[PDB]
PDB file of C-alpha atoms and ligand atoms in Angstrom:
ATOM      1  CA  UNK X   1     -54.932 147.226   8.873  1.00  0.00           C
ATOM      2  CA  UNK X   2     -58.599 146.141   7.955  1.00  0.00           C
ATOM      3  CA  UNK X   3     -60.183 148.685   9.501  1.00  0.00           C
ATOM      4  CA  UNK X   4     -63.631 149.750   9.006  1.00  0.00           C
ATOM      5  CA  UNK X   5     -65.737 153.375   9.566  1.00  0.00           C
ATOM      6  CA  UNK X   6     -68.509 152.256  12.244  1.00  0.00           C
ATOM      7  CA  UNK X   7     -72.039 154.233  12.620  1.00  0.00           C
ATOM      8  CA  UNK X   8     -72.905 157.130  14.107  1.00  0.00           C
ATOM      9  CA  UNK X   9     -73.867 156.339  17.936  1.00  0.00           C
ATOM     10  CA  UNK X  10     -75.273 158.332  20.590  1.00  0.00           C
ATOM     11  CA  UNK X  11     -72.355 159.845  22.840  1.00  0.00           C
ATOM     12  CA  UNK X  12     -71.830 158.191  26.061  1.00  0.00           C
ATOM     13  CA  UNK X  13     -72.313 160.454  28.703  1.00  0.00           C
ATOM     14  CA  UNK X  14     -68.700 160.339  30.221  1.00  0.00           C
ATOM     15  CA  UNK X  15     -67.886 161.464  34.139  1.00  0.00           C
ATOM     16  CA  UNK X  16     -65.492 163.440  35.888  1.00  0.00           C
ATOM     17  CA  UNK X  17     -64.381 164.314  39.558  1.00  0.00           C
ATOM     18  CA  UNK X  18     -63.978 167.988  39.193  1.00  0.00           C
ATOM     19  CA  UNK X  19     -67.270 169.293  38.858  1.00  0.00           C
ATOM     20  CA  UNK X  20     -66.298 171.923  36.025  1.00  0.00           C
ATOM     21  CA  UNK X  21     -65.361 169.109  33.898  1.00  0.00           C
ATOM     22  CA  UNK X  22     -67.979 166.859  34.896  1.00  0.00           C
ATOM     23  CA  UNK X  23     -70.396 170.341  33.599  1.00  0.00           C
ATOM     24  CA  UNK X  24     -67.806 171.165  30.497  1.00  0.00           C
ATOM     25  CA  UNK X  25     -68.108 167.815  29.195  1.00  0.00           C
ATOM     26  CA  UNK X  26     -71.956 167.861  29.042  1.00  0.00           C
ATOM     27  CA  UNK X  27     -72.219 171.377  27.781  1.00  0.00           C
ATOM     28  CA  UNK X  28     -69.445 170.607  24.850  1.00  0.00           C
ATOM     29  CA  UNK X  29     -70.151 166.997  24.152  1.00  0.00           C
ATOM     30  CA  UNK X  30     -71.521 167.502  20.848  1.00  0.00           C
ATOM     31  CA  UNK X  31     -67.925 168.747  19.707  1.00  0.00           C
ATOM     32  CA  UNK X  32     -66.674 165.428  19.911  1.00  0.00           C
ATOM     33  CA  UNK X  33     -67.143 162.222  17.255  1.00  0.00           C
ATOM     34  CA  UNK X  34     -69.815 159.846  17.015  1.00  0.00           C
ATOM     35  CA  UNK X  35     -68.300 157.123  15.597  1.00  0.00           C
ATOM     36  CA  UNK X  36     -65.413 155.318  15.670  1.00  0.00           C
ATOM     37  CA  UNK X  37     -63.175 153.095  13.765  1.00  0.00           C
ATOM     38  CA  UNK X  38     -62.030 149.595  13.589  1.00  0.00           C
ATOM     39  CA  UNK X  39     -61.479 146.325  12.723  1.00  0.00           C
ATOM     40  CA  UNK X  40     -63.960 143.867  12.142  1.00  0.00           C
ATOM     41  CA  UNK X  41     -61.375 141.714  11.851  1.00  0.00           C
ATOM     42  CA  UNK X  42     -60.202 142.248  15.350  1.00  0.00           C
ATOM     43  CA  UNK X  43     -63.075 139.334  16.163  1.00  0.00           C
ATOM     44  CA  UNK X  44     -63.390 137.031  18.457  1.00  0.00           C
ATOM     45  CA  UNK X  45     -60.364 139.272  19.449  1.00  0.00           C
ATOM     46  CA  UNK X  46     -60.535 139.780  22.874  1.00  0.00           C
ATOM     47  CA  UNK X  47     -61.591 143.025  23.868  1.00  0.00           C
ATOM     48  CA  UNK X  48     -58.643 145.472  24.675  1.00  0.00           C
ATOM     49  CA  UNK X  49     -56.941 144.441  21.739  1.00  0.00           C
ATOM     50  CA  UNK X  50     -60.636 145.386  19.708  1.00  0.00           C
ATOM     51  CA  UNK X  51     -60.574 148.989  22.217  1.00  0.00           C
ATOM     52  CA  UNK X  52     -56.794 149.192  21.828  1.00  0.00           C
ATOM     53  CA  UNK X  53     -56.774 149.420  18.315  1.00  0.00           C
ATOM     54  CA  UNK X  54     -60.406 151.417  17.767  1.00  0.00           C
ATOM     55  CA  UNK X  55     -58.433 153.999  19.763  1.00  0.00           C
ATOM     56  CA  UNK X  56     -55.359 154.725  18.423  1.00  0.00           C
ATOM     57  CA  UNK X  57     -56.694 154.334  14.805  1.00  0.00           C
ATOM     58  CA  UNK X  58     -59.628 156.548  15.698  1.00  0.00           C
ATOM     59  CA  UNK X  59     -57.627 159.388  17.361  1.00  0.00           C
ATOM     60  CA  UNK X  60     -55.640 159.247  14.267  1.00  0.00           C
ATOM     61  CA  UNK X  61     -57.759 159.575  11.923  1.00  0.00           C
ATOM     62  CA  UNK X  62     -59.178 162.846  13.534  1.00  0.00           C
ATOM     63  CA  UNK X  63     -55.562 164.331  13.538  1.00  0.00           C
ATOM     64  CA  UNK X  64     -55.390 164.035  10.246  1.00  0.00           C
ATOM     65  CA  UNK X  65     -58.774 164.633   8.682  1.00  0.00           C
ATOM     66  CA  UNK X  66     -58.610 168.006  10.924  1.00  0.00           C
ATOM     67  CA  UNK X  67     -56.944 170.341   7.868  1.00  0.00           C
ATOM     68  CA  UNK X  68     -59.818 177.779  17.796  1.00  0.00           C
ATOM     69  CA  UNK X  69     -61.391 174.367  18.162  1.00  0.00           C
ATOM     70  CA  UNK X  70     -59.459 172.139  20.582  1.00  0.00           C
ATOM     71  CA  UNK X  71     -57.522 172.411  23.734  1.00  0.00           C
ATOM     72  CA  UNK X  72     -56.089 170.256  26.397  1.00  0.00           C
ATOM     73  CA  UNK X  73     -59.814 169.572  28.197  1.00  0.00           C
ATOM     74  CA  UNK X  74     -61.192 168.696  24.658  1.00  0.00           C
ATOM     75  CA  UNK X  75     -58.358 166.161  23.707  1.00  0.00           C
ATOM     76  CA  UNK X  76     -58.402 163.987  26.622  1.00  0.00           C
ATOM     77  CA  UNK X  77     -62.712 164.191  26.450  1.00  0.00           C
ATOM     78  CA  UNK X  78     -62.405 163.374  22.751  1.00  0.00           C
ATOM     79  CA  UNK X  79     -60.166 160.569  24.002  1.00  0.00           C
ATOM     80  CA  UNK X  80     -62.787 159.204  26.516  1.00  0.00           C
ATOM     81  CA  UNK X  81     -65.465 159.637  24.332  1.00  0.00           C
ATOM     82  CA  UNK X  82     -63.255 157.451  22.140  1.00  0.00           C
ATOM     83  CA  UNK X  83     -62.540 154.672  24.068  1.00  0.00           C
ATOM     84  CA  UNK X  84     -66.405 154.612  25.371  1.00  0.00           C
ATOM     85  CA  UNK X  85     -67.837 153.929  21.818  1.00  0.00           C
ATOM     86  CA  UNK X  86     -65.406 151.417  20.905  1.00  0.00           C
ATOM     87  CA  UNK X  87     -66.708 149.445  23.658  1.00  0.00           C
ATOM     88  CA  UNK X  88     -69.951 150.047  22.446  1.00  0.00           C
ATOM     89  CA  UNK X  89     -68.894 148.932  19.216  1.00  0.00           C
ATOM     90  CA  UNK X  90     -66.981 146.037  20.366  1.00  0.00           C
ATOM     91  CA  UNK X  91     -70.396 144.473  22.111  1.00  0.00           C
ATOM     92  CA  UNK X  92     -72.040 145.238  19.104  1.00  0.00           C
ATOM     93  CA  UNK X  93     -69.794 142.865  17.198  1.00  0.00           C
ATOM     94  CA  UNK X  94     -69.471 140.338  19.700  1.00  0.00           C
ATOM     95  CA  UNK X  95     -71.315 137.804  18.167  1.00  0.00           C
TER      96      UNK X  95
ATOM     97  CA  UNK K   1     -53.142 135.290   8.795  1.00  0.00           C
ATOM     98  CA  UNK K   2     -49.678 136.933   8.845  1.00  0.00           C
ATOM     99  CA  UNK K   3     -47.891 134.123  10.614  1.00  0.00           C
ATOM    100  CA  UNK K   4     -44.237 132.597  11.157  1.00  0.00           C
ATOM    101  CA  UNK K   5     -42.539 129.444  12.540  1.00  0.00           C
ATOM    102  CA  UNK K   6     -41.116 130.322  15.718  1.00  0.00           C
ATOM    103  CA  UNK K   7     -37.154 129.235  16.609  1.00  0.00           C
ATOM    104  CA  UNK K   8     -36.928 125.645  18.368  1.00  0.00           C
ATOM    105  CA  UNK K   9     -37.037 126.365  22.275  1.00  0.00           C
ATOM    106  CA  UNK K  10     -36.633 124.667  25.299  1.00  0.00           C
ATOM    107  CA  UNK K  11     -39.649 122.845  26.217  1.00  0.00           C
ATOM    108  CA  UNK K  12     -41.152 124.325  29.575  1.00  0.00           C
ATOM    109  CA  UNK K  13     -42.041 121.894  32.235  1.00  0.00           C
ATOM    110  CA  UNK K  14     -45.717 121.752  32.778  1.00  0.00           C
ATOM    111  CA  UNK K  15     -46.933 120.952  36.838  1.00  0.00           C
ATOM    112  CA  UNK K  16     -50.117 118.720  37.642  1.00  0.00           C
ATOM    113  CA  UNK K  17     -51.727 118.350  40.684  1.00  0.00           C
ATOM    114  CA  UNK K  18     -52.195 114.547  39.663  1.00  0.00           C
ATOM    115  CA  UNK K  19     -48.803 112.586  40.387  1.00  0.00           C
ATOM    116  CA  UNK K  20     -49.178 110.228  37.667  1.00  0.00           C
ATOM    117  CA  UNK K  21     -49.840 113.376  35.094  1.00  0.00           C
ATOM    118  CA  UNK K  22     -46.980 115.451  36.575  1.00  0.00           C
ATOM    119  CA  UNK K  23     -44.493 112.611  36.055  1.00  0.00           C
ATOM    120  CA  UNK K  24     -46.181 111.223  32.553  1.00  0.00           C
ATOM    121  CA  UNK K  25     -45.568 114.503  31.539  1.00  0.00           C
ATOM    122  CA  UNK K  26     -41.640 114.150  32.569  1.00  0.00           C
ATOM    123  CA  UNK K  27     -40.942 111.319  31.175  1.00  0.00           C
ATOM    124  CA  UNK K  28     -43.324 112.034  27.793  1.00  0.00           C
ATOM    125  CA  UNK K  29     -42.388 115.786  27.122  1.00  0.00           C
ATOM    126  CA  UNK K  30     -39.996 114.862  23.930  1.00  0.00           C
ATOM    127  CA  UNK K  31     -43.211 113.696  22.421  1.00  0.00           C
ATOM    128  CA  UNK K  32     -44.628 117.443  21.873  1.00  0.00           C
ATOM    129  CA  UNK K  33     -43.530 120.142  20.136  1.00  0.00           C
ATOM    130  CA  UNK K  34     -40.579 122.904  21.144  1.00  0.00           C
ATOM    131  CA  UNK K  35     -41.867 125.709  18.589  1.00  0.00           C
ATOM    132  CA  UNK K  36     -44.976 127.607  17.962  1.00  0.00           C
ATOM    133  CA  UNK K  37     -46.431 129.418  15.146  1.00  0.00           C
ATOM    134  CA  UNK K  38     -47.502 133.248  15.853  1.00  0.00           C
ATOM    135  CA  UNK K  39     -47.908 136.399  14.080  1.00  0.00           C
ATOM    136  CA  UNK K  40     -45.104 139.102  14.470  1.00  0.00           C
ATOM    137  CA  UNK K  41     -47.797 141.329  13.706  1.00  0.00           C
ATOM    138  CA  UNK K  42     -49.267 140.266  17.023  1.00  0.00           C
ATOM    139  CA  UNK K  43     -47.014 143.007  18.092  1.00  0.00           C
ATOM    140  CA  UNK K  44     -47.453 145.578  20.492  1.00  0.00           C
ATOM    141  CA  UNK K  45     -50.602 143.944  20.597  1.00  0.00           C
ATOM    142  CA  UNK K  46     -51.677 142.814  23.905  1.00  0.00           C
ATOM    143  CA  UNK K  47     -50.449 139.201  25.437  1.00  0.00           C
ATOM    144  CA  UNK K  48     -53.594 137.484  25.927  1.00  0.00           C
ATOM    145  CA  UNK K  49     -54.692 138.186  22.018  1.00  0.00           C
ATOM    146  CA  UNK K  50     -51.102 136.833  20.570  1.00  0.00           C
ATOM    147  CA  UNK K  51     -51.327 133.710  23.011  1.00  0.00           C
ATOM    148  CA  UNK K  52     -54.480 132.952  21.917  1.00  0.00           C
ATOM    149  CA  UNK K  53     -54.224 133.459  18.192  1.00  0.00           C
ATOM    150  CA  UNK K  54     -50.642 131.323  18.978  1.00  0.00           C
ATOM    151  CA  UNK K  55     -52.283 128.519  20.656  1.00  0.00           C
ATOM    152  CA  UNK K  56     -54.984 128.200  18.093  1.00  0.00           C
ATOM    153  CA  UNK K  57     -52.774 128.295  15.085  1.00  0.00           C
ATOM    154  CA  UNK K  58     -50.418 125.958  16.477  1.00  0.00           C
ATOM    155  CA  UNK K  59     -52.018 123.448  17.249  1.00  0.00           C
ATOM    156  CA  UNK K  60     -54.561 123.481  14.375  1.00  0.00           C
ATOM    157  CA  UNK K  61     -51.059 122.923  12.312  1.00  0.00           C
ATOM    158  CA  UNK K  62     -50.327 119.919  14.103  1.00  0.00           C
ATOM    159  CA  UNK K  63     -53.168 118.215  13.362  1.00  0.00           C
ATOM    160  CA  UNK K  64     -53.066 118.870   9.873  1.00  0.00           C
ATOM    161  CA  UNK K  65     -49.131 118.495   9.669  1.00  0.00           C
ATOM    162  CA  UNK K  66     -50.365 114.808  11.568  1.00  0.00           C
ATOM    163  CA  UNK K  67     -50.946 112.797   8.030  1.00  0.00           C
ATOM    164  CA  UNK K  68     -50.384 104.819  18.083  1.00  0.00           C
ATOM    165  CA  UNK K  69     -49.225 108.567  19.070  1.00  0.00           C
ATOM    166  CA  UNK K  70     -51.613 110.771  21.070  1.00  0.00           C
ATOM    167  CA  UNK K  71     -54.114 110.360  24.153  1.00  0.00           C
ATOM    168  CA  UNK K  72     -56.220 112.465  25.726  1.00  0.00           C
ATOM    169  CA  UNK K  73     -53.698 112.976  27.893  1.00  0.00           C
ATOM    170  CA  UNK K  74     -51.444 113.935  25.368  1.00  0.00           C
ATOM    171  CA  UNK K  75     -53.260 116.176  23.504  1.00  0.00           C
ATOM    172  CA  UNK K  76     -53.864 118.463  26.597  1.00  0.00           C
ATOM    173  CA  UNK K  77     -50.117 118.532  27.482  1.00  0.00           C
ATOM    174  CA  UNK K  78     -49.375 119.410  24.265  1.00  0.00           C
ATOM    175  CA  UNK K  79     -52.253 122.238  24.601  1.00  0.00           C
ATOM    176  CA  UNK K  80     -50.472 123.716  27.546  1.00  0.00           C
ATOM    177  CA  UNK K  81     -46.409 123.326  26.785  1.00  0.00           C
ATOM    178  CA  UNK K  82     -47.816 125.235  23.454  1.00  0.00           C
ATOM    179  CA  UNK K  83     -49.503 127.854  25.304  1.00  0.00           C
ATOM    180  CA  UNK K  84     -46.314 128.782  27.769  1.00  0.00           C
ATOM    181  CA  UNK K  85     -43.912 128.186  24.848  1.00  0.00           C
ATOM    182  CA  UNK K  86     -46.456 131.082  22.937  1.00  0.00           C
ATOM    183  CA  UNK K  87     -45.983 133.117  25.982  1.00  0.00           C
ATOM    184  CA  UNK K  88     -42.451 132.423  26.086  1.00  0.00           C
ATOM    185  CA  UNK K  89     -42.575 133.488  22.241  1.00  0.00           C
ATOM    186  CA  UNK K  90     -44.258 136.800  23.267  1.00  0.00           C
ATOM    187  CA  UNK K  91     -41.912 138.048  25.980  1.00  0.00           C
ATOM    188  CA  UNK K  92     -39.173 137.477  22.934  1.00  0.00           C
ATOM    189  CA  UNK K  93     -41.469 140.015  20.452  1.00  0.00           C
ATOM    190  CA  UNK K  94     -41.874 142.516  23.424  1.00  0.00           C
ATOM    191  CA  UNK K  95     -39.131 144.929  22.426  1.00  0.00           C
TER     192      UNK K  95
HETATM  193 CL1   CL J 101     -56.712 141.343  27.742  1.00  0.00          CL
END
């Protein structure tokens, strides 16, 4: 429940099969977060539980703070996105 | 930090490649513990992250609790009937 706001990163470029998404994601990218939340505390916790958590708390926190915007595509790119820069911020704790 | 005493279990039996160790451990396995300290928190949270945090705080409360008893030996068959008895523990939290 310790859970921190992180900085704002650069987006990860993230890749998909179908070529319209692969296109949609770059073109709309900059709809999506740039930072993410977690725990510091989730350290030396082993990674998934660090990206586990990050997730789910980050995802939340975007439902709710979110008083046409967003369909289908952008929830599941927001959710890659996601997952992406809690890596990044996982390494960046790591030690 | 939110952590509880576990219920006494039956103590797994551990396998060594060594004959001597695999039998030592036989005939010495009432020397070690049969419960395990963990966090119920630790739930759904990924295996490998309540084992460890189970296998840490367990044993780091044994040697406290410990106010002519343990080998080498000892001390890593106690490390690894606590680890599959925190396992053990975590298949109980699951559900
Ligand atoms: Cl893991």
């Amino acid at each position: 429940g310790g859970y921190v706001l992180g900085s704002a990163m650069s987006r990860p470029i993230i890749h998909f099969g179908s070529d319209y998404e692969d296109r949609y994601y770059r073109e709309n990218m900059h709809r999506y977060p740039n930072q993410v939340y977690y725990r510091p505390m989730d350290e030396y916790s082993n990674q998934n539980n660090f990206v586990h958590n990050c997730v789910n708390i980050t995802i939340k926190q975007h439902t709710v703070t979110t008083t046409e915007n967003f369909t289908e595509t952008d929830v599941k790119m927001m959710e890659r996105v996601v997952e992406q820069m809690c890596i990044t911020q996982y390494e960046r704790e790591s030690q």
